[PDB]
Design a protein around this nucleic acid. Structure first.
Lengths: 128, 162, 140, 217, 87
RNA sequence: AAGCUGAGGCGAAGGCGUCUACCUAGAGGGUUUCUGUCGAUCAAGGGCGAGAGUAGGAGUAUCCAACAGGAUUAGAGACCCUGGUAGUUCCUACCUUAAACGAUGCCGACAGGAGUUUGUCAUUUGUUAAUGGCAGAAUCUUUGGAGAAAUCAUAGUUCUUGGGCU
RNA sequence: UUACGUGGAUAGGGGUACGGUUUUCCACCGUACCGACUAGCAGAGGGCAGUCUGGUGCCAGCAGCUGCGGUAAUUCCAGCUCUGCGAGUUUGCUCCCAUAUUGUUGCAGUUAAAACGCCCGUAGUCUGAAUUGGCCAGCAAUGGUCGUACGU
């Protein structure tokens, strides 16, 4: 059974990046599309095509080759701003790069966005 | 109520740590090895406080009040210059810096005692004062402001009695 | 993996943890109690009257007779062997005195060469062996 | 007359055609002579016997004992090497292991919190694992001092990190593993691709094809 | 990597593989740096080379052949070769 | 139930080989049939479960715990030899264990080539074949990663630590 | 060979007054006069400073652990030197860390201890995609345009 998608799909993207592929084939969703969009703003990834089949969907990523891991942690833990800077220290390797995708009330955005907007929420995973 | 001012070291018989600690005692003219370990423990509460402040945001209400208040207290003690007065430089500082601010050593720099050991003797025998106020205690920590005001107490030095 | 990770699954984790503590021998020894049926009775130091003097010998490879006194305790009225440290010292102890016994210092178990006994004599007659062995205190 | 260079690389150094260690590292060339590394860093680098150990092959006559040994080369600016060696004699082992370190020799560095001046710690946490041992080097705020085992600390100081954090795992008595997994951790520091080494610069000229006529005629 | 008051810090920058885009460390001695002579139309050399790079990962698999087809045709050193046909 | 009989097939595992008719189950394939999330894993609880063993009938050829001789040996309660009842076969109740072993729990995704092979379909007249598809079953390798090592396309994607349950 | 008869200084421990002090003593804080007795405890194979000299000879004994002692003891019993910490310093038992050897973070289960013999299966935990956005000014908060879908 497919327990989670966002968990599953980011494993497949990581297995492409280790190997050093040019593109990957992921059933699609509306959190996976937003998770890929937020790392497209920080230029870790190229540019991708969310195709129709009157079904779940597919995605074709285009890899730029600049990315080491996408985790997606679960269960989806609640986090609130004062509590957050523990979850940077645990999850990321460094201090000086790598972001923590969490679904804030406004939308899903990095930690760097989320502290600017002053809105926490549940966390999805990271990338670095 | 009470508190533990010095802490004992983790491993007793390390060669490098013992060989380090003699030539802090030798230079600054000191009684025991515990009179280092308090100043190590004093440096801890400065830096543990500082680091936590660093983790917080760059705009938070806690950092603005505490960060200004922390650097104010260290500019008194005369460790941070006005070049280095910017919060990350608190995470620096050594025991060699913080030992230098004590009364024993400030007498020596002054040269009134004439020796690091001599300075201790002058203070332990009620000869030295700080703005008309006698200081028996050989670890005062002087605040740069008052560093200028280090002088002979009165007795043998001024009175001239045998 | 290899455990329940889900949001509502805290009863499974808390209750499974209570089981796995009973594998750990330190939790098992504390909790069973299990310590009361002991000559020491869980007390570091005990005192009472000497019955006599006994020679118990070491295992192997160490060929040596150790000289441990038999001592009745005060509070339980049990009897137990107890080592006497330092050379001489069996001569210093005297027959039918009160002595203070304490542990071998191994937190239970049997220590060196010497099997069986888990106990050493700290004082005799309210003085202490080190003082006696050194001879800066006296016995009548 | 001193050392006579053998092979293409020694030849450039005696000549003085190439200056600095970085040129060699960037181009990823094998250093097959210790007389190279003596020349380039020829000032600060220091030998340090980490330990000796006895080792025993059985034979029909009982026990041919030999002495295994580590040394470690360490310039205080951001270089390190490590070598191991057995011999029957103790001096041949040590003077062997000194050479093996030089043959194998750049440690990347970066800041904890903010960019301040002059970096003092590992850019990102990295782990090098040799056999059972696992070594983890962790980013660490300024003026903390290094914390590890005294085996690891001696090697780390040579590396030059001002402050560091550490987390050992596995069977850390086996010191030849434990030191190697430390060395292998600092090797992984350049492997890990950051945001900073994006862009493409122009590829530098490989120093054989640049100087391919002084070499011959 | 940058000191941020100004400047640039660190010594040496590992070159990056053209196929995979990963860093080429100090010690991967299977790494390769080619030179290929660009030529004037009618095949005249111009004294100006293209330097193609590969990491030791890409050579180890087999695939560094197929990258040379792709990279050279992108730069304009071949025709055909890349892209079709089997059968 | 020989030979055919194999790193071949089927079965949840234990296990299943002559041929004929009989009742019965289902995996895989194909499907521009139908329903629409009905599912995954599981304390209790329920069934199936090699061989030995037990109870009561029906058999009793072969082989055979025990037992009886004969050899050998210092002794031989054994190995070797000659005989031998219980069991070995069928039916009705039980028992519920094995190195019950891939010593590898179940469902889900992705990550590398190579040629084998079983079932079945597709496009071709290379039609008991060629190439390709799903589903099995193994294998090889100068591939990557893992591991203490032996080794393993899973024992990989794990201090770069979190798909779900036991 | 800079620590192993001199040269002088400066204390407080202590003593005796008086002034403060407190309900009263003590002790403290002052002021003046008297002045040439103050360090142990634990060790010196390795973990973690002697291959000194003397006595002992698997005996006495030491020793948390590994080990030492059988007449050459770098571990015993003594002396001398040296080391640690220092008005402190060993020794018992309980207890946390060391310990990711109790694992939420965070262990392990082919062979080291560890996958129910198999299938069904309830409690339990877990449960594919889909629902008001696009476009421009961005540094965000937001503000415009495209869509008018016209209930209380």
């Amino acid at each position: 059974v497919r327990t989670s998608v966002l968990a599953d799909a980011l494993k497949a993207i990581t297995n492409a990046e280790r190997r050093g592929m040019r593109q990957v084939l992921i059933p699609s969703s509306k959190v996976i599309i937003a998770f890929l969009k937020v790392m497209a703003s920080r230029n870790y990834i190229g540019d991708f095509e969310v195709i129709d089949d009157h079904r779940s969907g597919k995605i074709v990523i285009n890899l730029l080759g600049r990315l080491n891991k996408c985790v997606a942690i679960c269960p989806r833990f609640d986090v609130g701003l004062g509590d957050l800077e523990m979850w940077q220290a645990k999850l990321l390797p460094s201090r000086q790069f790598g972001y923590v995708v969490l679904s804030t009330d406004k939308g899903i955005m990095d930690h760097e966005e989320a502290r600017k907007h002053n809105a926490g929420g549940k966390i999805l995973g990271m990338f670095f | 109520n009470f508190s533990r001012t010095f802490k004992k070291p983790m491993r007793p018989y390390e060669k490098e740590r013992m060989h380090k600690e003699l030539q802090v005692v030798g230079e600054y003219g000191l009684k025991n090895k515990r009179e280092i370990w308090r100043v190590s423990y004093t440096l801890s509460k400065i830096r543990h406080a500082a680091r936590e402040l660093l983790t917080l945001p760059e705009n938070d209400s806690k950092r603005i009040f505490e960060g200004a208040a922390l650097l104010r207290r260290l500019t008194k003690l005369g460790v941070l210059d006005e070049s280095k007065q910017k919060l990350d430089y608190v995470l620096s500082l050594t025991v060699n810096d913080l030992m230098d601010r004590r009364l024993q050593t400030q007498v020596h720099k002054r040269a009134l005692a004439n020796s690091v050991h001599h300075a201790r003797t002058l203070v332990s025998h009620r000869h030295i004062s700080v703005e008309n106020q006698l200081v028996n205690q050989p670890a005062f920590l002087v605040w740069k402001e008052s560093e200028k005001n280090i002088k002979y107490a009165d007795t043998s030095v001024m009175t001239t009695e045998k | 993996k290899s455990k329940a990770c889900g949001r509502l699954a805290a009863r499974k984790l808390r209750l499974a943890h209570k089981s796995n503590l009973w594998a750990s021998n330190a939790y098992r020894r504390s909790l069973g109690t299990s310590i009361y049926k002991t000559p020491l009775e869980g007390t570091s130091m005990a005192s009472g009257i000497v019955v006599g003097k006994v020679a118990v010998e070491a295992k192997q490879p160490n060929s040596a007779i150790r000289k441990a006194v038999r001592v009745q305790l005060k509070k339980n009225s049990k009897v137990v062997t107890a080592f006497v440290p330092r050379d001489g010292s069996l001569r210093l102890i005297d027959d039918n005195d009160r002595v203070l016994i304490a542990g071998m210092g191994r937190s239970g178990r049997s220590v060196g060469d010497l099997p069986g006994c888990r106990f050493k004599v700290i004082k005799v007659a309210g003085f202490s062996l080190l003082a006696l062995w050194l001879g800066k205190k006296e016995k009548p | 007359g001193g050392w006579q260079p053998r092979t293409k690389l020694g030849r450039l150094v005696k000549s003085g055609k190439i200056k600095s260690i970085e040129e060699i590292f960037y181009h990823a060339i094998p250093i097959k002579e210790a007389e190279i590394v003596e020349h380039l860093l020829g000032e600060d680098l220091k030998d340090e016997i980490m330990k000796i150990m006895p080792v025993q092959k059985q034979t029909r006559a009982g026990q041919r004992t030999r002495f295994k040994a580590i040394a470690a080369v360490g310039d205080g600016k951001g270089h390190i090497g490590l070598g191991i060696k057995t011999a029957a004699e103790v001096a041949n082992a040590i003077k062997g292991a000194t050479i093996y370190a030089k043959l194998s020799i750049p440690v990347r560095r970066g800041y904890w919190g903010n960019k301040i001046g002059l970096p003092h710690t590992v850019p990102n946490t990295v782990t090098g694992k040799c056999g059972s041992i696992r070594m983890r080097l962790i980013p660490a705020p300024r003026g903390s001092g290094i914390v590890a085992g005294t085996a690891a600390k001696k090697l780390l100081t040579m590396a030059g990190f001002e402050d560091l954090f550490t987390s050992s795992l596995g069977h850390t008595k086996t010191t030849f593993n434990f030191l190697v997994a430390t060395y292998k951790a600092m090797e992984e520091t350049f492997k890990f691709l950051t945001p900073d080494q994006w862009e493409d610069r122009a590829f530098e000229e490989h120093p054989f094809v640049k100087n391919s006529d002084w070499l011959h005629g | 990597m940058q000191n941020d008051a100004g400047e640039i810090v660190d010594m040496l920058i590992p070159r990056k593989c053209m196929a995979t885009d990963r860093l080429i460390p100090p010690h991967d001695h299977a790494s390769v740096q080619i030179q290929i002579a660009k030529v004037n139309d009618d095949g005249l050399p111009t004294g100006e080379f293209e330097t193609v790079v590969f990491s030791g990962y890409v050579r180890a698999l087999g695939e560094s052949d197929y990258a040379l087809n792709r990279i050279a045709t992108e730069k304009g050193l071949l025709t055909g070769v890349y892209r079709n046909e089997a059968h």
